[PDB]
A paper describes a structure:
In all living cells the signal recognition particle (SRP) recognizes nascent polypeptides destined for secretion or membrane insertion as they emerge from translating ribosomes. As SRP binds to signal sequences emerging from the ribosomes, the resulting complex composed of the SRP and the ribosome-nascent chain complex is then targeted towards the membrane through the GTP-dependent interaction with the membrane-associated SRP receptor (SR also named FtsY in bacteria). We describe the X-ray structures of [name] and [name] the two protein constituting the proteinaceous core of the SRP from the hyperthermophilic archaeon [name]. [name] and [name] constitute the conserved core in all archaeal and eukaryotic SRPs.
We solved two distinct crystal forms of Pfu-[name]. Two molecules of [name] associate in a dimer with an extended β-sheet surface built around the anti-parallel association of their respective β2 strands. The tetramer is organized around two dimers facing each other through their respective β-sheets at an angle of 45°. Pfu-[name] is characterized by a more extended β-sheet due to longer β2 and β3 strands when compared with all other available [name] structures. The structure is also characterized by two loops (L1 and L2). The loop L1, the primary RNA-binding surface is rigid and well defined in density whereas the loop L2 is disordered and absent in our final models. Superposition of our free [name] structure on the RNA-bound [name] structures reveals that the difference between free [name] and the RNA-bound forms lies exclusively in the conformation of the L2 loop region. The disordered L2 region of the “free” protein has a well-defined conformation in the RNA bound structures. The structure of free Pfu-[name] reveals a compact entity and suggests that this subunit acts as a molecular scaffold and a chaperone involved in assembly of the functional ribonucleoprotein particle. Through an induced fit mechanism involving the rearrangement of its disordered L2 loop, [name] assists proper folding of the SRP RNA and therefore favors subsequent binding of [name].
Numbering used by the authors:
A (entry chain D): 2 to 56, 67 to 98
B (entry chain C): 2 to 57, 67 to 98
C (entry chain B): 2 to 58, 68 to 103
D (entry chain A): 2 to 58, 66 to 103
Write the structure that this text describes.
């Protein structure tokens, strides 16, 4: 359905307590808003909103619409970002 | 622990497909960012980030919170506090 | 005209080099986005967009407004309105 | 000095009433936040803050940049606009 993706949810540098949701092996180090959006589009998810504030440290959020629930979508996104990085 | 809260997650005007997470009876109608921040503060959750963009005003936003509880339980507690504020 | 207001433009805590536009005596300490919005509404300026980001540590943002005056005059009027708001609040109760 | 750049200030698609500061021929069509940042960096300005919000009505964009420049804002906006025009000509392969 529709949900928010917060980059920390996919960040392998973080504990679950600090925001990571995906298993650390699936997660990637310091995922960027730009990478998440790129993956979402490759995965044919609809991008509803992308907000980014850079102060440079980046703070951001993405709202997505997907054929699947958030958990599954986050994994597909993390895997896609890993692909991007392996090339 | 730490997690994001997107207002649509506790919006009773939305189906689960369109973003709602909490049970529709606990959900509240059109929760505002300010309402969520106020509830979090009353619940002694730590507010880490609050972003809001308002256009023409239609609002878009997110809150990052630190809670002793997981997101599901925290969203429910927040919804209840918002209901309480509104009732006054 | 339509123009952006950046809160630092009227912040007396800041030097001109760091972004303050209005004279220091008219500027106010740490103007909040919400106060600028309230001032604009009392001044009958139309608010087109309000963006704010608050980070735990604090506040960043911008307001797009329409005003019958140029930006420089409008900033001064907003600063003076906020000064009035804060004073009215202080004397209350 | 430090100041804000609001992309509409240099957007040739807009009238002055809707926010455009610089002359229309210097302004460029729909300058993107990222283009302004790229221009500022090329011009040796220092970028302090960049905010952008993109909403699906591809996406409608809203944003602002805080910059530091040796020049006043009016001249900096013109320099930025003309630099973006140059980048775009390069991307188009038209000099
Ligand atoms: Br774990
Ligand atoms: Br989380
Ligand atoms: Br993006
Ligand atoms: Br949204
Ligand atoms: Br964040
Ligand atoms: Br699923
Ligand atoms: Br996987
Ligand atoms: Br989260
Ligand atoms: Br954060
Ligand atoms: Br939103
Ligand atoms: Br929970
Ligand atoms: Br629960
Ligand atoms: Br409760
Ligand atoms: Br402006
Ligand atoms: Br303007
Ligand atoms: Br406001
Ligand atoms: Br706008
Ligand atoms: Br700022
Ligand atoms: Br005037
Ligand atoms: Br524009
Ligand atoms: Br505009
Ligand atoms: Br004009
Ligand atoms: Br005009
Ligand atoms: Br012209
Ligand atoms: Br022209
Ligand atoms: Br032009
Ligand atoms: Br152009
Ligand atoms: Br164009
Ligand atoms: Br950028
Ligand atoms: Br050089
Ligand atoms: Br800033
Ligand atoms: Br804007
Ligand atoms: Br400089
Ligand atoms: Br100059
Ligand atoms: Br100017
Ligand atoms: Br151009
Ligand atoms: Br061309
Ligand atoms: Br040519």
């Amino acid at each position: 359905g529709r949900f928010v993706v917060w980059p920390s949810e996919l960040d392998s540098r973080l504990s679950r307590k600090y925001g990571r949701i995906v298993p650390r092996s699936i997660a990637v180090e310091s995922p960027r808003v730009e990478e998440i959006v790129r993956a979402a589009e490759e995965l044919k998810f609809k991008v509803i909103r992308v907000e980014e504030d850079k102060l440079l440290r980046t703070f951001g959020m993405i709202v997505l619409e997907s054929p699947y629930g958030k958990s599954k979508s986050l994994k597909l996104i993390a895997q896609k970002i890993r692909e991007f990085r392996r090339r």
